[PDB]
Design a protein around this nucleic acid. Structure first.
Ligand SMILES: [Mg+2]
Lengths: 79, 221, 224, 49, 313, 219
RNA sequence: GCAGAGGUUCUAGCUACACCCUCUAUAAAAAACUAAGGACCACACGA
């Protein structure tokens, strides 16, 4: 649970790019079987996504790199 | 330290009674007084009326012939009526009155276990000579105040919200006692205003037991 | 009664139509919740056909604002009543004095912010003694409409309903007078031609004081 | 006249009585104004809103 | 149908009536924190019915959505626990009917309460320009993850302390808490426990709560003042500063970074606004929010203790 | 009807050795405030603990003065001495004497034990001496008092904080069990001088309050 | 389970937002179940 999102807003300056990146992360959590790297403690997907952003473990660049890598294994799976 | 004891119990009247706790250190007396007042007001064993069944009327709003006031007024008067039961947590009281004259609480047919604390209390007035009211009063032992809506069958049965609060006001004043060779000792005096269902000393004992049981959660007995 | 009042409360109560005021002063031979009967004094009564005055107090009935109107008798048997005297207390009326609300002990002090700027804090004692419990009467009307594919029935039997809900209704399909109903329950059973049974609005919980059914001429009245 | 009315009763003429907190139990400093006031329940109930 | 207020533009295109909206009267609920608001159980049930149905299907309690609706109608125990799960971290928008400025609608993290009235945190009520007089606020529920995250990041009250119109904070104490702070931050020339030295704010609070020393009396106390002059670091300064017991008690509430000069004064409403502004500029948003909640609690408590009653005399 | 919901604490949160948080979830409607106020007032007004009440320094005999060669004023020294907390044995009163010279702080470790009495916090500082040649000599008096007795009510005198507690604040928050009306949840934050662990202090205060009520309950 | 019908119930149930199984022209061993449509103008009142 996060009362405020400041740590995120200095993690992501725009605070609207923050919404987009953390929304994509939470979408990956709900739709994909992937789970948040930071442990979940009775927290919804958006809250734990903001928590992951807070630690700096997740950002827009890292998220784009991760999805590109996942598409790479998707291509490699077909061979 | 010194442990207070129920040195004196004084009854200025049946409803109003005073209990005194003579030996108490500075600070202990006022803390104990506030705690006892809150415990007594919050929760005490009470025997207020729970449900009333009227032979002649189905619901509380409609009125019966020959009765001065509405059935709703009768129910709310019965709410004020208070009884004390010695051995039964549940009891049924039956009221029958015929002819002109007020229907007092004394007229209620009472078992050996259940006794009406205030016979002078009036439920209704039967103005018409050929008017008779038959009531089945259900009294349940309970704690605190329960609204009628919170609880829960026949259409004739009427539910009145019960108030198992035997004590109306509890006032305590801290006055210094006069021990032969001692200092900083004060006697706690609690003024109890109650409908009379619960004994004052018994109520103090129950409140003390409840507070002690609650404290036993904090530290092992 | 208002402990602090203008003094015009008596005038308002008397002049308002809710209060039943004796046409002719006299002694009350009989007083009842439904009606009050006055034995008129010999002087004030007419020389012929005066008889004795009878007043029928209206019981709990709906208002245009859904508030109960109830005249509670204000006099006892054998109590003399003078000319132009209040007989029974109408809504918000006590002893012929207009009593809109219940007055009570009031302390002016902030209390942990629970009364922040205009908020009001109320003791449990107020709820316990039913000082502000106000009877609200809501009228619900279900109308049998002549329609295509046959008129809609008033029968108790309804497709796809619980038997417990149908238990509250009578044989003819109308809830028993004096029954207790809650939100979602069916009061009167009506079936659309081929379902349309009237239902208690969600949240509303009360008892039915009375049920009145009006039927057009030429169509048979049901059992209820 | 109000002061005389209070003096007729046992109540203080000041109109302010020392009041004790229900929870803490310590009497409030600066004794508060306590008295009976007429209060009307408006039909604007919460459940309808 | 096109032009005018009744025209389709303003009626149904510019401002559209929306679903998942709940309306009820306002209540203070001082126990709530800044981001939390009271929300009735039935109101949250009605607003969050699709989420409840989805969670019921996921739990396997109801095989079909019709079964879930039947379960909700029964209002059985498991439905309440499901409602607790969805409400826990799902912001809802509290919105006063005339939305004069941007702060008119602000999200809150709902807390389920037994009742029928919405509780709004006292500090933000000044920002909402809302009294407690049959005032009613609409409650809209964000649905998508983008929406919930958007509300938490922006719409939430703790996120916007400063009003957009001016840099001055908008959650400034308004009626009761400001009065209590003023009562604490005052000096009486003679009062109980005057002229004694006190080890710290803890000892001041202990003396007041014991009642032997009066709330407002000039006493020399030792205070551990922290300075932000160090670059990204707090340095402790210990000194004996003449002050009242009330001010010393208030000092433990404020964060470390703020100096003692702000609390040393009488702390009128403008003074408290400046205090909050300095806290926002120095300590940051989160310490400012925590300090605002704590200061509201202390103001309420010490105003209740004061009993500042209005009287004819 | 005689039965009550008896609380079962879910956690005892501890931030430091001196400062701990205790919370009890179920309790009862209105019982939380009663218990919190009772415990708070009982452990402020009366707690078995020993603190410094009388001080004698050979340097000066007047409170509104400054000992030569000492950075701290004696009034500042009085405050630091008040802050000092000491555990004592069965004996009620013991006098401890120190004569220290040289530049450096006077640690609570450096005070002479002068008996089996032992100080809980050696790290605590009484005063600082600027001059090496200058020396400090103090007489310290401790009493097994019960509560906080100001010296104003009572040749140097210092207020005595006999009660080991420093700060306590009880807060009542709404709690529920299953589906039931609002029930108080009592959270108690206790800070002690260190002579006794805060949870042990709570248990001792509860035992004292129970002993006050042993007469009526009759087991 | 996507075009229809049948089945153990209760006229009808083929995903209609909608609940189970079968197949591409044939009807039953089987328990939880069912309904998706409707404005303006005036008055008064609260903010
Ligand atoms: Mg308003």
């Amino acid at each position: 649970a996060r009362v405020t999102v400041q740590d995120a807003v200095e993690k992501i300056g725009n605070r609207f790019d923050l919404v987009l990146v953390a929304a994509r992360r939470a979408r990956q959590m709900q739709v994909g079987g992937k789970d948040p790297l930071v442990p979940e403690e009775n927290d919804k997907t958006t809250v734990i996504a903001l928590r992951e952003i807070e630690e700096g473990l997740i950002n827009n660049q890292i998220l784009d790199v991760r999805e590109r890598q996942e598409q790479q294994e998707q291509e490699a799976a077909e061979l | 330290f010194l442990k207070p004891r129920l040195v004196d119990i004084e009854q200025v009247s049946s409803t109003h009674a005073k209990v005194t706790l003579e030996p108490l250190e500075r600070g202990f007396g006022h803390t104990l007084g506030n705690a006892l007042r809150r415990i007594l007001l919050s929760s005490m064993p009470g025997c207020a009326v729970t449900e009333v069944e009227i032979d002649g009327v189905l619901h509380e709003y409609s009125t019966k012939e020959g009765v001065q006031e509405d059935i709703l007024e009768i129910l709310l008067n019965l709410k004020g009526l208070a009884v004390r039961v010695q051995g039964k947590d549940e009891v049924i009281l039956t009221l029958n009155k015929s002819g002109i004259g007020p229907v007092t609480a004394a007229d209620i047919t009472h078992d050996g276990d259940v006794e009406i604390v205030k016979p002078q209390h009036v439920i209704c007035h039967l103005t018409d000579e050929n008017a008779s009211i038959s009531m089945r009063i259900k009294v349940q032992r309970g704690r605190g105040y329960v609204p009628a809506s919170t609880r829960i069958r026949p259409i004739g049965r009427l539910l009145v919200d019960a108030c198992y609060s035997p004590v109306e006001r509890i006032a305590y004043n801290v006055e210094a006692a006069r021990v032969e060779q001692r200092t900083d000792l004060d006697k706690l005096v609690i003024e109890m205003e109650t409908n009379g269902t619960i004994d004052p000393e018994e109520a103090i004992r129950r409140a003390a037991t409840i507070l002690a049981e609650q404290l036993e959660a904090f530290v092992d007995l | 009664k208002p402990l602090v009042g203008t003094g015009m409360e008596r005038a308002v109560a008397v002049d308002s139509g809710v209060t039943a005021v004796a046409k002719r002063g006299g002694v009350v031979q009989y007083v009842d919740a439904s009606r009050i009967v006055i034995k008129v004094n010999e002087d004030e009564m007419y020389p012929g056909e005066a008889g004795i005055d009878i007043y029928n107090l209206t019981k709990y009935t709906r208002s245009n604002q859904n508030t109960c109107i109830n005249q509670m008798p204000c006099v006892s048997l054998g109590e003399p009543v003078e000319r132009g005297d209040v007989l029974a207390d109408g809504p918000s009326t006590d002893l012929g004095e207009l009593a809109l609300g219940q007055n009570m002990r009031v302390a002016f002090m902030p209390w942990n912010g629970y009364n922040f700027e205009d908020s009001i804090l109320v003791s449990e004692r107020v709820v316990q003694e039913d000082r502000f419990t106000t009877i609200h009467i809501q009228e619900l009307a279900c109308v049998s409409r002549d329609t295509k594919l046959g008129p809609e029935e008033i029968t108790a039997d309804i497709p796809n309903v619980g038997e417990a809900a149908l238990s509250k209704l009578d044989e003819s399909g109308i809830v028993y007078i004096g029954a207790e109903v809650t939100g979602g329950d069916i009061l009167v059973g009506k079936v659309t031609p081929k379902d349309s049974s009237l239902r208690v609005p969600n949240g509303v919980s009360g008892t039915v004081i009375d049920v009145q059914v009006f039927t057009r001429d030429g169509v048979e009245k049901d059992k209820r | 006249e109000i002061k005389e009315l209070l003096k007729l009763g046992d109540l203080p003429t000041s109109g302010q009585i020392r009041l004790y907190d229900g929870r803490t139990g310590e009497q409030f400093e600066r004794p508060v104004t306590v008295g009976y006031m007429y209060m009307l329940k408006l039909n604007h109930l919460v459940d309808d809103k | 149908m096109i032009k005018g207020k009744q025209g389709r533009f303003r009626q149904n295109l510019l401002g559209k009536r929306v679903d998942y909206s709940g309306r009820s009267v306002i209540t203070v609920g001082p126990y709530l924190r800044l981001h939390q608001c009271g929300l009735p159980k039935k109101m949250a049930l009605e607003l969050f019915k699709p989420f409840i149905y989805g969670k019921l299907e996921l739990r396997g309690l109801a095989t079909t959505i019709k079964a879930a609706k039947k379960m909700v109608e029964r209002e059985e125990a498991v439905v309440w626990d499901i409602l607790d799960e969805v409400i826990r971290e799902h912001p809802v928008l509290l919105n006063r009917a005339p939305t004069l400025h941007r702060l008119g609608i602000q999200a809150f993290e709902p807390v389920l309460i037994e009742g029928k009235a919405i509780q709004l945190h006292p500090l933000v009520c000044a920002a909402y320009n809302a009294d407690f007089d049959g005032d009613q606020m609409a409650v809209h529920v964000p649905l998508t993850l983008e929406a919930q995250l958007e509300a938490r990041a922006l719409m939430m009250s703790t996120n916007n302390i400063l009003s957009p119109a001016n840099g001055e904070p908008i959650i400034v104490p308004s009626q009761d808490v400001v009065l209590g702070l003023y009562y604490m931050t005052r000096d009486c020339v003679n009062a109980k426990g005057e002229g004694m030295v006190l080890t710290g704010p803890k000892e001041a609070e202990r003396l007041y709560r014991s009642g032997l020393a009066s709330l407002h009396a000039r006493v020399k106390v030792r205070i551990t003042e922290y300075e932000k002059d160090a670059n990204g670091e707090l340095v402790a300064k210990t000194s004996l500063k003449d002050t009242t017991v009330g001010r010393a008690i208030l000092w433990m509430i404020v964060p470390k970074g703020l100096p003692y000069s702000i609390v040393n004064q009488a702390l009128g409403k403008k003074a408290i606004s400046k205090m909050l502004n300095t806290c926002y500029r120095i300590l940051g948003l989160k310490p400012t929010v925590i300090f605002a909640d704590q200061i509201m609690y202390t103001g309420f408590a010490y105003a209740a203790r004061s009993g500042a009653s209005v009287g004819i005399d």
